[PDB]
Write an enzyme that holds these catalytic residues in place. Structure first.
Site, PDB file in Angstrom:
ATOM      1  N   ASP A  17     -10.002  11.571  33.992  1.00 57.49           N
ATOM      2  CA  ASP A  17     -10.068  10.243  34.590  1.00 57.49           C
ATOM      3  C   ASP A  17      -9.706  10.385  36.064  1.00 57.49           C
ATOM      4  O   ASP A  17      -8.551  10.678  36.400  1.00 57.49           O
ATOM      5  CB  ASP A  17      -9.117   9.274  33.878  1.00 57.49           C
ATOM      6  N   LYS A  34       0.820  -1.206   0.000  1.00 59.40           N
ATOM      7  CA  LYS A  34       0.000   0.000   0.000  1.00 59.40           C
ATOM      8  C   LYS A  34       0.856   1.258   0.000  1.00 59.40           C
ATOM      9  O   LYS A  34       0.500   2.245  -0.647  1.00 59.40           O
ATOM     10  CB  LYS A  34      -0.954  -0.012   1.187  1.00 59.40           C
TER      11      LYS A  34
END
Ligand code: NA
Ligand code: NA
Ligand code: NA
Ligand code: NA
Length: 327
Positions: free
Chosen positions: A187, A67
């Site tokens: 968090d 690719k």
DNA sequence: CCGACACCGCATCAGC
DNA sequence: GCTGATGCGA
DNA sequence: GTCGG
């Protein structure tokens, strides 16, 4: 990190492939293979000139090299160009950007003609509570949080937690604790001496207080151990209001708290190393505990941990500040 | 050749 | 109604 | 898709 002008066409391509694997093909392991290929390339400090050159990097195989060859020669990728013009696949991929809509929900929606945010707005009755919140804050959730807003947010969390009970311990982890100049969410790790591994409303009291002062605005999920929701800083009069932000809060037994903080501080790369190293010294670390490993491989009982440094001392590593845990 | 690629809390579904 | 599975996000 | 036992 080398300027993305270096191989940004390549890493952008791989990330786009990654997303279609995850969201359209439901091939989570190919998603992660493309992510890993894109990561190792993004840190490669040379402009790649061939697929064979990239193939030397760990995580780049035969197919991504092929690719890259085609991208370098043509400036695009036939398969990727095709999938972007595909109305069904691009719509499925797009809808997953709504928090609560995964690959399965996105495919169901597109199947029944629901393809855009406007289509979602018209069909509230087919969204669950989480997806409705994700739609509402679709734009806000995709903005990052500047560190100064994270400090203002921390101020509120730590103040209100101590107000409920001055014996709580709260720690804001993630990249913010490592010193990042921006965050994607907040968090929060929470503990209390009355809660150990063999010790029921400790989480709820904190959530309730943050809702009472109107910091927490919405709840995505909430149980005895984990809260996930939405918060917003208070807006000064006349000034544009702040975006809504994602906040998670976890209640962790005291005897597992610092293993938790070490883990949810990261980075992911630093975590792999430390567990690698720990293994090589006879210990097994997870997010909960550190345990010794006997000669035949049998893990014994968890070792007492009263600080992060306790973990480092066990594995004969010198304490590293959060700021130095990039790797 | 072919299995691993992390684990888990919560909301919700699928099956009884 | 209960129990386990699945989807989702971390 | 990539790695490795
Ligand atoms: Na390679
Ligand atoms: Na989503
Ligand atoms: Na998403
Ligand atoms: Na007190």
């Amino acid at each position: 990190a080398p300027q993305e002008t270096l191989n940004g066409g390549i890493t952008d391509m791989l990330t786009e492939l990654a997303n279609f694997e995850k969201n359209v093909s439901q091939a989570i392991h190919k998603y992660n293979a493309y992510r890993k290929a894109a990561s190792v390339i993004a840190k490669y400090p040379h402009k790649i000139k061939s697929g064979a050159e990239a193939k030397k990097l760990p995580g780049v195989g035969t197919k991504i090299a092929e690719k890259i060859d085609e991208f370098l020669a043509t400036g695009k990728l036939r398969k990727l160009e095709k999938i972007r013009q595909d109305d069904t696949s691009s719509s499925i991929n797009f809808l997953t950007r709504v928090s609560g809509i995964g690959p399965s929900a996105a495919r169901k929606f597109v199947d029944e003609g629901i393809k855009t945010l406007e289509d979602l707005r018209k069909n509230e009755d087919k969204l669950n509570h989480h997806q409705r919140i994700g739609l509402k804050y679709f734009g806000d959730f995709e903005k990052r949080i500047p560190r100064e807003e994270m400090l203002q947010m921390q101020d509120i969390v730590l103040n209100e937690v101590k107000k409920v009970d001055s014996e709580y311990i709260a720690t804001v982890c993630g990249s913010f604790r490592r010193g990042a100049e921006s965050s994607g969410d907040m968090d929060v790790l929470l503990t209390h001496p009355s809660f150990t591994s063999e010790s029921p409303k400790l989480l709820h009291q904190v959530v309730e207080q943050l809702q009472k002062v109107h910091f927490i605005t919405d709840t995505l999920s909430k149980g005895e151990t984990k809260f996930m929701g939405v918060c917003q800083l208070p807006s000064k009069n006349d000034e544009k209001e702040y975006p809504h932000r994602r906040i998670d809060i976890r209640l962790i037994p005291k005897d597992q708290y610092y293993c938790g903080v070490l883990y949810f501080t990261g980075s992911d790369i630093f975590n792999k190393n430390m567990r690698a190293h720990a293994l090589e010294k006879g210990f097994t670390i997870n997010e909960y505990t550190i345990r010794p490993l006997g000669v035949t491989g049998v893990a014994g009982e968890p070792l007492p941990v009263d600080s992060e440094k306790d973990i480092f001392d066990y594995i004969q590593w010198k304490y590293r500040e959060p700021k130095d845990r990039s790797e």
